[PDB]
Design an enzyme around this catalytic site. Structure first.
Site, short mmCIF file in Angstrom:
data_model
loop_
_atom_site.label_atom_id
_atom_site.label_comp_id
_atom_site.label_asym_id
_atom_site.label_seq_id
_atom_site.Cartn_x
_atom_site.Cartn_y
_atom_site.Cartn_z
CD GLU A 151 -3.05 -1.37 2.48
OE1 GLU A 151 -2.47 -0.34 3.46
OE2 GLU A 151 -3.39 -1.96 2.63
CD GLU A 237 -2.82 -6.03 5.05
OE1 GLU A 237 -1.34 -6.01 4.55
OE2 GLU A 237 -2.86 -4.78 5.11
#
Ligand code: MG
Ligand code: NA
Lengths: 301, 283
Positions: A151, A237
């Site tokens: 991210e 994730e």
């Protein structure tokens, strides 16, 4: 040096394989700390975690979001767990107001009189720490992939115009450092179809990479597969279900808690996430999603 | 009269005007609306119904918060045992808060009553003729179950009083109801119309004071409106009165002509409610 004979593949259509046989990545994300011991990388505490995950049927760990202790590489080598060793969280932009995180060091240069050894020193700290990690574990049979970020564009300020270039540079650094493993990352903006994430995923693919998407559902896994047929993908994730141990007097997190705990029923997850049965349902049904790395295996501080 | 603790035996108003005009002594207010203590007396005195009543009403702007934002929850019942529950806002599942059992006492002449003798009983003995829990506030529903000495549930259709209180929404609608929907056409007989102010889901809003206006047409006349509020100096002969604590009453009287009575209760911004009273003749 410890070694093991083994090879892997990532197909865009049917997913992942080990030594010629298809295998589904049944993985967890794991932070470094050992609970009441804090951050201390005690070998037995480490080994016990793996033993407990193995009994759950887990066969792969993502080292979120930073190189593991060598002890954790030792146990998986010995235990037969597949490791995805991630080197970075943020890149050259700090997250969450954390002005002293590695976001401020990533792009800095290394001083001439700095005699620190481990990786290459001719560019930035980013390259030094990346190659230092690859140097320590390049022969580790458990390690199947290098993850280069997570991210990277999340919880930052400023434009993201520069990230596809920074990404291509990290990929080039890794391919040159070790050719035997694909590189990857965990990107949470694919599901939002950011132009920059498309560009970065293509650079991943062009270089024999594997694209990990953070928090895609069934509907979003499918579009990725349609609009980008060349990508091999997986849930880097997943889920982020939120639960206390042994709490039963409510079955949802649908109301606001009052005892600072949450239900033990699987009906509780963050707004960007999914309950455990849902994040697994989406993955198991799709041969093109190599597997999952549930956030998390163990609670962390 | 006698509006103790605002009483006065000579001339002049007590406290700012309008001053309390009627008593606070009554178990039932002037309009015939029961106060909470009504159900204490019922748990003690009425052998022909069962009682399970909860106070307070459960909105944040009417409760009292003591130590640890704990709200004193009180239960009046004749039952042998009570289980107390909480249901979070928007949920369908309740959790057990507490459970308390009464002990039965018998006098020499055979009279029997009940007192709580558990470990967390009140140090003041008479307060143990009822049950008290301290419950942390949180939006939702407090509900109760009642059990007999054989641990058999006492069902809701056999019990009087509020076995649950819940966090309501903003005032949404009026709900009118005539105590007798047919009355005699003798020019004397009355019908009492209870109007409630409730949210979208029919829950009485505990502090609603909406001004309700009555429109009566047909074979009858409005002869009174009331809310039992002591300081309320509005005319009893008006066609409108503020509700008090969620309720207002209108009283209609028949004529000496058989027919029907139409009564509509209106309030601003609220959904209106209508009833109809028929009046039968005399041979
Ligand atoms: Mg006098
Ligand atoms: Na009774």
């Amino acid at each position: 040096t410890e070694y093991g004979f083994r090879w892997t593949g990532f197909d865009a259509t049917s997913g992942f394989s080990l030594n010629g046989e298809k295998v589904k990545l049944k993985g967890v994300s794991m932070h470094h700390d050992q609970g009441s011991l804090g951050a201390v990388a005690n070998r037995r505490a480490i080994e016990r975690q793996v033993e407990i995950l193995q009994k759950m049927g887990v066969n792969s760990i993502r080292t979120t979001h930073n190189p593991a202790a060598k002890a954790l590489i030792d146990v998986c080598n010995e235990k037969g767990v597949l490791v995805v060793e991630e080197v970075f969280d943020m890149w050259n932009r700090s997250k969450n107001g954390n002005t002293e995180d590695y976001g401020k060091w990533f792009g800095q240069t290394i001083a001439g009189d700095n005699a620190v050894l481990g990786g290459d020193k001719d560019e930035t700290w980013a390259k030094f720490d990346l190659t230092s990690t690859i140097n320590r574990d390049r022969n580790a049979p458990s390690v199947i992939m290098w993850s280069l970020g997570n991210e990277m564009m999340e919880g930052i300020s400023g434009s993201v115009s520069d990230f596809p270039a920074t990404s291509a540079k990290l990929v080039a650094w890794t391919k040159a450092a070790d050719s035997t493993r694909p590189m990857t990352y965990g990107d949470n903006k694919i599901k939002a179809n950011w132009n920059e994430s498309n560009t970065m995923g293509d650079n991943l693919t062009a270089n024999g990479g594997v694209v990990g998407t953070n928090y895609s559902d069934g509907a979003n896994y499918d579009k990725i597969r349609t609009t980008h047929p060349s990508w091999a993908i997986y849930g880097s994730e997943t889920a982020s279900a939120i639960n206390s141990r042994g709490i039963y007097n409510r079955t949802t997190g649908g109301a606001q808690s009052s005892d600072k705990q949450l239900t033990s029923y699987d009906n509780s997850a963050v707004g960007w996430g999914a309950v455990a049965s849902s994040a697994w349902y989406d993955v198991v049904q799709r041969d093109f999603v190599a597997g999952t790395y549930v956030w998390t295996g163990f609670d962390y501080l | 009269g006698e509006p103790t603790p605002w009483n006065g035996t000579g001339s002049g108003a007590v406290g700012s005007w309008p001053s309390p005009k009627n008593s606070y002594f009554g178990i039932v207010d002037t309009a015939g609306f029961p106060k909470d203590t009504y159900y204490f007396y019922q748990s003690q005195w009425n052998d022909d119904v069962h009682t399970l009543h909860i106070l307070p009403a459960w909105n944040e702007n009417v409760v009292a918060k003591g130590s640890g934002n704990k709200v004193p929850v009180v239960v009046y019942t004749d039952a042998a045992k009570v289980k107390l529950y909480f249901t979070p806002k928007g949920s369908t599942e309740k959790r057990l808060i507490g459970e308390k059992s009464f002990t039965k006492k018998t006098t020499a002449a055979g009279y029997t009553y009940q007192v709580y003798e558990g470990t967390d009983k009140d140090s003041t003995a008479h307060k143990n003729m009822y049950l008290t829990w301290n419950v942390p506030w949180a939006e939702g529903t407090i509900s109760a179950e009642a059990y007999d000495e054989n641990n058999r549930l006492i069902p809701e259709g056999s019990t009087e009083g509020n076995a649950s209180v819940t966090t309501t929404g903003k005032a949404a609608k009026l709900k009118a109801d005539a105590d007798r929907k047919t009355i005699t056409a003798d020019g004397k007989d009355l019908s009492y119309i209870e109007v409630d102010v409730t949210d979208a889901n029919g829950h009485i809003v505990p502090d609603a004071a909406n001004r309700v206006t009555f429109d009566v047409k047909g074979a009858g006349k409005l002869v009174g409106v009331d809310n039992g509020s002591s300081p309320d100096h509005d005319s009893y002969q008006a066609d409108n009165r503020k509700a008090f604590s969620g309720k207002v009453l209108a009283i209609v009287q028949s004529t000496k002509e058989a027919g029907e009575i139409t009564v509509t209760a209106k309030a601003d911004g609220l959904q209106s409610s209508t009833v109809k009273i028929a009046t039968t003749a005399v041979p």
